[PDB]
């Protein structure tokens, strides 16, 4: 059949499992938007306020799905706003296909052309960047983008298609590749690696299992619970792993790291051995600025590139996390030293339950205070009173990150969402809409800073029009609080950190969202209830302090050290001059 | 002599004429922000709601100054939001220096590092991209960035500095290059080229002078007025040149192009010869999608890359526009065929005034009607009643761009501001705030679509805190109106074009800005008076049609052609298969 | 200890298993060459005639070793000659670390600087490109280059180091990373993928096993022989797989492809099922220009990126080749339909032995003719008379490639060497020296075209000085014969294909190598014997025809189709003009 390039793009997206499109109109995306109107996928298109906002919605959607189920489709110069959200998708292992419709290929390369987008600007960011030159390559390029996005590591793929190819027509026989099969990711380890891992776990005096986001992608929750109870070993997570182990369990120490739970950081500091499953041991995760001293450890990942890149393990294993844990459970009964004992009766149990008890006690102190300005831990205690096991907690980047991570007690995977890998401010609100779209039976609670919300609150348009009932708490301190605190620490003085807020209640109301301030009442519980009862997206304005959280609270972290001291650098004495220095010698 | 890298960065910026910093705080820009607090630039700091809004402010400030007077200074990952503004700066010839402070150079190249920004993403966009490796190269790199940025052509320069270098200390002797005098840009043309141009101009039956952006940069307004009156030749502009020739003059035909004045397009279609001064003859300018047929022409520019790249001139001249006009003025009296008569007495004068009067009559007609929805041409007629020669008109991108350009009647250079080169949606409000900052005693009027305003109205924080009293009119139609109109024409149906507006008055009021809707009054005149009287940034909501403007109004345009017909493309029958096609051959 | 950057580079190379350095001197490599003189590795440095020649020696060395055992180290502007050999290492999966010493970092970025090498020119080629900014990062960068080079896929890694860092000094504590462990590559498949593969093999009427270079990297020869005899299935290889199965076995069909053995191409055309092990199914390999129609197949690779990229398998499996084959052998006895029968008694045996017999018969016809000009198949028959099982056959790119591939009958892996992935002319001679250096108990026989040998015969310097007794046959036809033939086919006329040769015997003699022409004698057997007896590198000049081989001989290929016909392309009618067209409308 003769079809337009635009029709073929839509066909390819459908064929590879696309569920949601986030799209922006302009002359170069007109044929694509028309094609979409004639197809199933056309019923699910979000038109965002900005392309960057839309790109964050893709990331929030796909983060919780672990596939490229949301796809961006953008008019040429709109693609120029993608890079920040794309960089998060790359280091954060978020599958994300973006299709940019560039201007007419006939005008490419002409110096005075308009809206010829430099697609090569994505080469250092996307896991795959393709410029499509020929109509008969559109299906093949889209196929390749999805293979790349959904591989190990997951990440973003950018496809640049000059829009004249979307208007042109071609016979479609075999053009969109069909019948594609994927290899399983259930990679098994060799018996001897399994036995060695088991023997170390058994011989350790104070082992820990460290479960990262890979355990979530793996589906390894059930095997992890079994394993930990069988060996009687406390479980620490990364922030992307949090919730793969029920955080109300006695062996649950929570997440390690600089914004994590002190019980986890204590347990990591006390451990003599760690079994790491599905973690990349990253800079703002377990590495803490590459300061963390890891105990002897076994490291199991599906991505060989993360194994041994910085931390040298006792043993590295290329295996799926669930599968590895299943292999361990089978081998443990024939492992020298293993005794089947209730985890409560093991000798390491009391130390772990002590660490968790002290952390819980500290959290209870943080959340117990009444009144205004509010504790962000108190705000999270109120959320927990109305929270379901499938609900999603979203945060932005700032002081507020710490109380959000600390007051989230999670029972399922992929329920904690932010710009994890890159810490890009403004991510929260639009990632929350993305997650809501992907998970319509989850209530989505976002705790955002005021500096953060300033970025993409324009997307209340999308929250209102698509009836996405995200409950947003905006923590107001009229400051970039983390920056305030860190400057205060480093210099004893802050600069560029202070600003005015609008009447956020008034902003919400102007969009037709639910709005309420607790500034005078302190009634967070009632504000949450009325917000939930409205059925609308909601904004609850909650004044807090400039310093509570990431930059001040002691949770046992050791880094990252962003507060450098300098070094004195020797001048170059080799005899060569500086530019302009010739005039000094005259 | 002993200084931190952060102090040397500040010292270099001050040395090369920086007047305004637009900066964004974070763990990598902490040192820089501290150093700036020790400088007189410390009081001239704008902290924008987002780095992209800030980068648009940089573009608006520098567009009106023709130098990199405003500089950006950004925490590592905020640099990832710059690309769209930076691309307009590149093709739009706006000088712009951006300093990105990256994360620690010790952590660079680690696969699991956080906030290590891929500075290489700027290589295809900036006219200069540098990654500084060494503390003793920071002054040198910044010097180079200004050299590129304020060259011919002007554009953006990006410098990536790992922030450990900003904390490190070094003896500062000779580190910041100082005391350069740049080359003059008053390039003279050869005598023979000036005399050939004079002879073409005199021999033409119906000549036109086309003045672009380059005439504004050259400071050539006075020379142009003298040349145009002395030969009696009508003047056509590009949108960036508009105002270099007073548009109330009898010889002013306005701007040619698809959102230009019909008088200018009528003139261009009637001319037998064009003298092109400081125009790049661009896709969305004079070329109109490379469909415009140019008459025989002489092309004078300082940038040889634009001369003969697409349209082949009769004669190409590398020279400064002002300087060339001066040279022409001096040779014309000795040029065979020249006659010294008042421009009103030439026979070509009548046709030009007819073209201008028919255009003015059409504009008068678009101004009439009342009440609701209102005409955007009516909105501009009300602005003109309150507008002084030094005041600035800003627009965003969409249907509304055409009445903003058609309703702007300008008497000075650099008074019409937008994302000219790239038509990046959203640009209007923050570029207007940048322009206001550059000219605190000019009034700045913005006409913006509702789609457009949605991008960076968050920068009302900056407008309110810094008391930048931009007068913004937001044209409401609950639509990407251009898309609605054109998609209906292409396909019989619009898609992805419609959206809800907030209560725009309520948004302004929530920021502390002046807000008023004319939905129930039609009282644009009174709204403008009250907005001006408020002394605050102001937002006036004006309901408009989905169709008025760019997608609907005939102004003599021939292009561009974005509403493509397909071609049917032959399949490759050489024997190579598609991916997956192996499955289709299994019997 | 305070050490120079140069000393630290040498330390890192030693620590990561470097055996051979190929190095070129200049002001920027002076400190490195000095450091090398003070260390074990300094005894093994080849100084080549050119950096490109040297880069091919790295590729020949590392091709046969399957690790980055040879390393390039180059003065700044010398690195500009690397790109061709580096591109082969990338698509050809050859591990190769190259260290470029750039000019002084103080002069970087200055427009009028000399010898500031644009290291970004390697970004699109190397699997990893790093520019080192800081002395304390030299060890870490070299560590990362080796992890990358020796991963799956293998490939080149480029490290650019401004030479001032090689002269500078730093305390060395922990600077070079030590104690690095690698994950095994013995990835196991899930039981159900194994059982499904076994069931298909058993149920097939005419199965084939296709073994690629991955079987060589895997060490899978023994398991392959067992498997094939157990199921009674004929074995086809790729050209990089050739020799993983003894090519004198009754089930050995040889290599498929456009320069392969007709028995293999027949068997592929007759097969109803293929089990593909360690092959990427490439353009100039099995795909034959993407024209080859693959039967239903199972595809097993360690690199998920090759699985399903073009050919859609019945099943894709991420597993090590040897391990997979071991798993199959275990599962086969409990697989429905399997009967233990001598492979000679299976029903498919007669068809396979017929295909091989016809091919052998054709080869015997090609090699039997006496006299001059010579058959290149006759030349390969003479090599076979003096050939050991560990000997290496090298070829360059041309008509001569086909007889070289056809007349090589191999019994061990990694014995057939050329620019396999990219077909870059001139590769042969220097790759042969590289292979000789890596394998000093192998005799290395190169059959090269005259157009090919012209590139890097300057490296006879290296062959003579290091006593590398490569036996080179130069096939003279005074032409780029493959080009002659293909132009003749396409146009009926050739252009740019003809040239003069020097007296090649005289060239060899001028270097102190052994030289002999068979132009008058036809005595290839005696020339080989005297060349071998000399103990020197040798050149034997052998006139041949312009057309024998790749471009003419029927071996059952179907592609690639480089002889396109064109299509008529519609003009653009949208109304926009060409540059300069304005003058046509005047
Ligand atoms: C302000 C801020 C504060 C933060 N604080 C913390 C903190 O305190 N603690 C913290 O942990 N993080 C924190 N982060 C997040 C941190 O930056 C990283 O995003 C996070 O630590 C990475 O988690 P991970 O190591 O589990 O790997 P991920 O990024 O989740 O990647 C998944 C890993 O699992 C592997 N994998 C995938 N699938 C499988 C499978 N099937 N089998 C095996 N392996 C698989 C992948 O190859 C990869 O190595 C913070 C972020 C910010 C912005
Ligand atoms: C929606 C939309 C509609 C538009 N419609 C129109 C329209 O109708 N008409 C129109 O013209 N534009 C239009 N534009 C703008 C258009 O895209 C270009 O930005 C504009 O035409 C470029 O102007 P210019 O050719 O004068 O060159 P500029 O971009 O202003 O560049 C300046 C030129 O002069 C040169 N120069 C600089 N200094 C000197 C000197 N001292 N001496 C000599 N030469 C010098 C430079 O090298 C360069 O060639 C539109 C844009 C948008 C987004
Ligand atoms: C003139 C010329 C003619 C040619 N003619 C032919 C021809 O007729 N036939 C032919 O085959 N080639 C031919 N080639 C070579 C061809 O271009 C390719 O280089 C070759 O076919 C690739 O072999 P391969 O598919 O085995 O993969 P390789 O390039 O050898 O790559 C190895 C593959 O095995 C995998 N692998 C690596 N280790 C393991 C492991 N442990 N377990 C599992 N998998 C692993 C890798 O991921 C990869 O997919 C020719 C080249 C030239 C220049
Ligand atoms: C795009 C971007 N710009 C700047 C920063 C630096 N940054 C990190 S946290 C932060 C503070 C955010 O302020 P707010 O959202 O109000 O949260 P608070 O610290 O007050 O809780 C800043 C400015 C960043 N990470 N990303
Ligand atoms: C970043 C970006 N996204 C999309 C476009 C395509 N585009 C061009 S004009 C326009 C319409 C703008 O709508 P509005 O501001 O409401 O103006 P109207 O057309 O209604 O006057 C769009 C979506 C663009 N140029 N830039
Ligand atoms: C670097 C390079 N240049 C050109 C070619 C194109 N090419 C491929 S085979 C060949 C013929 C080589 O001639 P020769 O070595 O004499 O071998 P013959 O075909 O005569 O056997 C040519 C020119 C190539 N592959 N690589
Ligand atoms: Mg479907
Ligand atoms: Mg805040
Ligand atoms: Mg609108
Ligand atoms: Mg050793
Ligand atoms: Mg030849």
Angle of CA points B173, B177, B181, to nearest 5° = 140
**B569 neighbors A138 (Cβ within 8 angstroms):** no
Cα torsion angle, A427, A432, A433, A435, sign? positive
CA A425 – CA A480 distance, rounded (Å):
10
Strand B471-476, strand B416-417: pairing:
unpaired
Name which of A17, A22, A149, A53 is nearest A92 in CA terms: A149
CB A244 within 8 A of CB A415: no
Note whether A571 contacts B290, CB cutoff 8 Å. Answer: no
Structural tokens at position A574: 């080799």
For A12, the token pair is: 């390819």
Those residues whose C-beta lies under 8 Å from the C-beta of residue B525, and which sit 6 or more positions away, are B382, B385
Residue C560 preceded by cis peptide, ω within 30:
yes
Identify residues whose C-beta is under 5 A from ligand 11, the ion. C 449-451, 477, 479, 481
| Interchain proximity C185–A147, CB inside 8 Å | no
Q: Indicate if B357 and B384 belong to the same structural domain.
A: no
Angle formed at CA C477 by CA C472 and CA C478, multiple of 5 degrees: 105
Angstroms from C49 CA to nearest CA on chain B: 34
Q: Look up residue B481 and give its two tokens.
A: 């109106």
CATH number at residue B364: 3.40.50.1220
Range of the domain at C311: 188-369
* B101 DSSP β-pair partners: B75, B161
Give how far Cα A61 sits from Cα of A279, A535, C390, C410, C566, Å: 21, 21, 57, 54, 45
Q: Are residues B466 and B380 in the same domain?
A: yes
A477 is in an annotated binding site: yes
How far away, in angstroms, is B31 Cα from ligand 4 center? 16
How far, in Å, are A24, A29, A101, C275 from residue B493 at the CA level?
16, 14, 20, 52
Q: Which helix (H) or strand (E) holds A42?
A: none
Spatial neighbors of B539 by CB under 8 A, at least 6 apart, are B472, B474, B504, B505, B507, B508, B513, B514, B515, B516
Report the C-alpha gap between B54 and B74 in whole angstroms: 10
Cβ atoms within 10 A of the Cβ of B330, count?
11
The torsion angles phi and psi of A97, rounded to 5 degrees, stand at -90, 130
- In whole angstroms, give the CA distance from residue B31 to residue B167: 6
Helix axes C524-534, C376-385, angle to 10 degrees: 50
Task: Tell me the C-alpha distance between C544 and A110, whole Å.
Answer: 51
Protein residue whose Cα sits closest to atom 9 of ligand 6: C398
User: What distance in Å separates the CA atoms of residue C311 and residue A177, rounded to the nearest whole number?
Assistant: 10
A307 with C183: Cβ contact below 8 A: yes
Block residue for tokens 């776990």: A201
As a whole number of angstroms, the distance between CA C204 and CA C233 comes to 10
Cα B97 to averaged position of ligand 4 atoms, centre (Å): 23
Q: Searching chain A, which residue's CA lies closest to the CA of residue B123?
A: A121
* B169 contacts A566 by C-beta, under 8 angstroms: yes
Which strand (E) or helix (H) includes residue C395? Answer: strand C392-395
- Helix (H) / strand (E) containing B151: none
DSSP A248-294: TSTTEEEE-STTS-HHHHHHHHH-SEEEEES----TTTTTTTTT--P
Lining ligand 2 with CB less than 6 A are A 114; B 92-93, 152-153, 185, 212-214, 217-218, 238-241, 255, 257-260, 278-280, 282, 284-286, 301-303, 306, 320-321, 397, 401, 420-421, 423
Dihedral pair phi/psi, residue A377, rounded to 5°: -65, -35
Strands A273-277 and B156-162: unpaired
Residue ranges of alpha helices (H) inside C288-398 are 321-331, 349-368, 376-385
Nearest CA in chain A to C571: A106
Whether residue A560 has a cis bond before it, omega within 30° of 0: yes
How far is Cα A39 from Cα C97, in angstroms, rounded to an integer?
A: 50
How big is chain A, counted in residues? 586
Q: For strand A169-171 and strand A2-4, is the pairing parallel, antiparallel, or unpaired?
A: antiparallel
C450 Cβ below 6 A of ligand 6: yes
User: A193, C184: Cβ pair inside 8 Å?
Assistant: yes
* Chain A residue closest in CA terms to C141: A309
What is the layout of strands, in order, in the sheet containing C514-517? C416-417, C392-395, C444-449, C471-476, C538-543, C514-517
Please report the sign of the dihedral spanned by the C-alpha atoms of residue A220, residue A225, residue A226, residue A231.
Answer: positive
Q: How far is CA B576 from CA A177, C290, C310, C491, in A?
A: 14, 5, 11, 21
Give the sign of the dihedral formed by CA C211, CA C216, CA C222, CA C223. negative
| Paired residues of A509 in beta bridges | none
Burial of A460 (0-12, 13-18, 19+ CB in 10 A): buried
Longest dimension (CA), chain B: 89
- Distance in angstroms (rounded) separating the CA atoms of residues B460 and B446: 13
CA B393 to chain centroid = 12
Residue with tokens 């959200």: A85
Helices (H), C38-158: 51-65, 83-91, 138-149
Q: Is the CB of C547 under 6 A from ligand 6?
A: no
Is residue B13 within 8 Å of residue B142, measured between CB atoms?
yes
Close Cβ partners of C118 (under 8 Å, ≥ 6 residues apart): none
Q: Is A140 in the same domain as A215?
A: no
Q: Is C26 exposed, middle or buried (0-12, 13-18, 19+ CB in 10 A)?
A: middle
| Strand ranges for B122-203 from DSSP E | 128-131, 156-162, 169-171
Token look-up 């959290």 returns: A363
State how far the Cα of C382 lies from the Cα of A393, in Å rounded to an integer: 75
Q: Percent helix, strand, coil in chain A (nearest 5)? A: 40, 15, 45
Contact (Cβ atoms closer than 8 angstroms) between residue A476 and residue A449: no
Range list of H helices, A339-468: 349-368, 376-385, 401-407, 428-438, 450-456, 460-465
- For C51-64, letters b (16+ CB in 10 Å) and e give bbbbbbbbbbbbbb
DSSP state of B374: P
CA angle in degrees (0–180, nearest 5) for A158-A162-A167 = 125
| Interatomic CA distance for residues B370 and B524, integer angstroms | 11
| C182 and C42 belong to one structural domain | yes
Selection from A49, A51, A47 nearest residue A37 by Cα: A47
Please tell me the residue having the least CA distance from ligand 3 atom 13: C285
B493 within 8 A of B487, measured Cβ to Cβ: yes
Query: Ligand 1: distance of its center to the CA of B400 in Å?
Result: 47
Alpha carbon of B287 to ligand 9 centroid (Å): 27
Contacts of C401 by beta carbon, 8 Å cutoff, 6+ apart:
C259, C395, C418, C482, C549, C550
- Ligand closest to CA C549: 6
Touching subunits of B (3+ CB pairs, under 8 Å) are: A, C
Q: Which residues have CB under 8 Å from C115's CB, separation 6+? A: C28, C76, C77, C103
Q: Mind spelling out the 3-state secondary structure of B435-480? A: HHHHCCCCCEEEEEEHHHHHHHHHHHHHHHHCCCCCEEEEEECCEC
Is residue B139 domain-shared with residue B280, that is, in the same domain? no
> Tokens 């040429």 map to which residue?
A76
As given in the structure block, the two tokens for residue B294 are: 């140019």
Q: Report the residue among A377, A425, A494 best suited for mutation to probe ligand 4: largest number of ligand atoms under 8 A from its CB.
A: A425
DSSP codes of every residue in C450-496: HHHHHHHGGGHHHHHHTT---EEEEEE-SB-HHHHHHHHHHHSS--S
Task: Tell me the nearest-neighbour CA distance from C203 into chain B, angstroms.
Answer: 17
Nearest CA to ligand 1 atom 26: A212
Nearest ligand 5 atom to the CA of A24 is: 4
**Continuous segment of H or E residues that includes residue B412:** none
* Number of Cβ atoms within 10 Å of the Cβ of A362: 18
**Helix C51-65 / helix C428-438 crossing angle, nearest 10 deg:** 50
Rounded to the nearest angstrom, the minimum Cα separation between A532 and chain B is: 22
Same domain, residue pair B97 and B227:
no
* Residue listed under structure tokens 């002046």: B514
What Rg, from alpha-carbon coordinates, does chain B have?
26
- Residue that terminates a domain, selected from A341, A369, A397: A369
- C198 and C215 housed in the same domain: yes
Q: Which of A482, A472, A501 is nearest to A400 (CA)?
A: A482
Same structural domain, B316 and B382: no
**Residue C235 contacts residue C207 (beta carbons within 8 Å):** no
Whether residues B293 and C108 touch (CB distance < 8 A) is answered with no
Neighbour count for residue C558 (Cβ, 10 Å): 17
Distance CA A195, CA A332 (A): 8
In which residue are the tokens 């200018």 written? Answer: B264
The CA distances from residue C223 to A536, B359, C324, C338, in Å, are 64, 87, 9, 18
SS3 of chain B: helix, strand, coil, percent, to 5: 40, 15, 45
Question: What is the whole-number distance in angstroms between the Cα of residue A544 and the centre of ligand 8?
Answer: 9
Distance of alpha carbon A367 from its chain centroid, rounded? 26
Q: How many helices, marked H, and strands, marked E, lie in chain B?
A: 20, 21
Both tokens of A32, joined, read 């694509």
Per the annotation, binding residues of C are 51, 450, 477
Kindly give the interhelix angle for A321-331 and A191-203, rounded to the nearest 10 degrees.
Answer: 70
C308 φ/ψ sector (left φ>0, alpha ψ -120 to 50, else beta): left
Compute the radius of gyration of chain A from its Cα atoms: 26
Query: In three state form, how does the secondary structure of B252-288 look?
Result: EEEECCCCCCHHHHHHHHHCCEEEEECCCCCCCCCCC
Method for structure elucidation: X-ray
Rg of chain C's alpha carbons, rounded to an integer? 26
Contacts of C177 in chain A (CB under 8 A): 312
Q: Per the structure, how many domains does chain B have?
A: 3
C-alpha distances (whole Å) from B246 to each of B202, B211, B234, B266, C349 are: 23, 12, 12, 19, 94
Q: Does residue C237 share a domain with residue C123?
A: no
Are B377 and B367 a contacting pair, CB within 8 Å? yes
Distance CA B62, CA B56 (A): 10
Choose one of A187, A220, A253: the last residue of a domain: A187
Strand ranges of the sheet holding B471-476, from the earlier edge strand across to the other edge: B416-417, B392-395, B444-449, B471-476, B538-543, B514-517
Which residues line the pocket of ligand 5, CB cutoff 6 A? A 24-26, 51, 75, 77-78; B 396-400, 423-425, 449-452, 475, 477, 479-483, 549
* Positive or negative torsion for Cα A106, A111, A112, A115: positive
CB burial readout A1-18, b (16+ within 10 A) else e: eebbbbbbbbbbbebbeb
Query: Which CATH number is B95's domain given?
Result: 3.40.50.970
Structure tokens at C447: 């059959």
* Boundary (domain end) residue, out of A156, A187, A218: A187
Q: What is the DSSP letter of C287?
A: T
Could you give the 3-state DSSP secondary structure of residue B355? helix
User: With 0-12 CB in 10 A as exposed, 13-18 as middle and 19+ as buried, what is C123?
Assistant: middle
CB–CB of A42/B502 below 8 Å? no
Tokens of A356: 């968790």
Best residue for ligand 6 mutational test, from C380, C446, C448, C451 (most atoms within 8 Å of Cβ): C451
Beginning with the edge strand found earlier in the chain, give each strand of the sheet holding A2-4 in spatial order: A2-4, A169-171, B568-569
Query: In terms of domains, do C390 and C514 share one?
Result: yes
Nearest ligand to residue A85 Cα: 4
In this structure, are A401 and A308 located in the same domain? no
Give the distance (Å) from ligand 5 centre to CA of residue B425. Answer: 5
Which residue reads 């047929």 in tokens? Answer: B293
Dihedral class, residue B10 (left if φ above 0, else alpha if ψ from -120 to 50, else beta): alpha
- Which two three-digit tokens encode residue B144? 């180079």
Length of chain C equals 586
Residues A245 and A308 in one domain: yes
Report d(CA B415, CA B413) in Å as an integer: 6
Distance CA B406, CA B256 (A): 11
């Amino acid at each position: 059949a003769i079809k337009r390039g635009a029709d073929l793009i839509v066909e390819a997206l459908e064929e590879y499992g696309t569920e949601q499109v986030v799209g922006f109109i302009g002359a170069t995306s007109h044929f694509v938007a028309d094609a979409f109107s004639k197809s199933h996928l056309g019923k699910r298109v979000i038109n965002p306020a900005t392309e960057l906002g839309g790109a964050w919605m893709v990331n929030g959607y796909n983060y919780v799905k672990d596939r490229s189920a949301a796809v961006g489709a953008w008019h040429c110069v709109g693609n120029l706003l993608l890079h920040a959200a794309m960089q998060e998708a790359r280091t954060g292992r978020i599958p994300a296909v973006h299709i940019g419709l560039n201007s007419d290929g006939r005008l490419a390369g002409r110096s005075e052309a308009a809206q010829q987008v430099p697609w090569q600007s994505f080469t250092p960011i996307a896991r795959s960047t393709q410029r499509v030159e020929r109509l008969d390559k559109v299906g093949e390029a889209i196929h390749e983008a999805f293979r790349v996005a959904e591989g190990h590591p997951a990440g973003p793929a950018y496809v640049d298609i000059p829009f004249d190819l979307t208007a042109d027509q071609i016979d479609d026989k075999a053009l969109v590749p069909r019948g594609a099969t994927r290899a399983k990711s259930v990679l098994h380890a060799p018996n001897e690696d399994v036995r060695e891992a088991a023997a170390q776990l058994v011989a350790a005096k104070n082992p820990v299992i460290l479960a990262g986001g890979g355990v979530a992608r793996s589906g390894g929750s059930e095997a992890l619970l079994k394993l930990a109870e069988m060996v009687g070993v406390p479980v620490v997570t990364t922030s992307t792993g949090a919730g793969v182990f029920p955080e109300t369990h006695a062996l649950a120490m929570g997440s390690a790291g600089f914004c994590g739970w002190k019980s986890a950081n204590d347990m990591m500091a006390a451990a003599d051995f760690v079994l790491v499953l599905g973690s990349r041991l990253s800079d703002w995760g377990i590495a803490q600025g590459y300061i963390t001293k890891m105990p002897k450890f076994v490291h199991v990942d599906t991505d060989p590139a993360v194994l041994g890149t910085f931390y040298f393990p006792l043993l590295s294993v290329v295996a799926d996390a669930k599968t590895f844990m299943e292999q361990l459970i089978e081998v443990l009964p024939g492992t020298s030293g293993f005794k089947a004992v209730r985890y409560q009766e093991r000798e390491n149990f009391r130390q772990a339950t002590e660490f968790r008890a002290a952390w819980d006690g500290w959290v209870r102190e943080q959340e117990s205070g009444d009144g205004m300005p509010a504790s962000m831990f108190r705000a999270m205690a109120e959320v927990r009173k109305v929270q379901r096991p499938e609900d999603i907690i979203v945060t932005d980047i700032g002081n507020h990150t710490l109380p959000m991570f600390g007051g989230a007690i999670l029972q399922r995977p992929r329920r904690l969402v932010t710009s994890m890998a890159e810490g890009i401010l403004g991510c929260g609100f639009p990632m929350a809409l993305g997650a809501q779209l992907a998970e319509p039976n989850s209530r989505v609670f976002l705790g955002t800073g005021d500096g953060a919300l300033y970025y993409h609150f324009n997307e209340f348009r999308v929250a209102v029009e698509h009836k996405l009932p995200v409950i947003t708490m905006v923590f107001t301190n009229e400051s970039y609080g983390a920056n305030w605190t860190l400057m205060n620490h480093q210099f004893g003085q802050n600069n560029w950190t202070e600003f005015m807020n609008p009447d956020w209640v008034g902003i919400a109301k102007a969009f037709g969202a639910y709005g309420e301030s607790v500034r005078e009442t302190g009634d967070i519980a009632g504000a949450l209830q009325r917000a939930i009862d409205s059925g609308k997206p909601a904004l609850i304005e909650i004044p807090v302090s400039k310093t509570q959280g990431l930059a001040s609270d002691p949770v046992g972290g050791v880094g990252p050290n962003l507060l450098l001291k300098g070094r004195e650098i020797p001048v170059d004495t080799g005899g060569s001059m500086y530019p302009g220095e010739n005039l000094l010698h005259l």
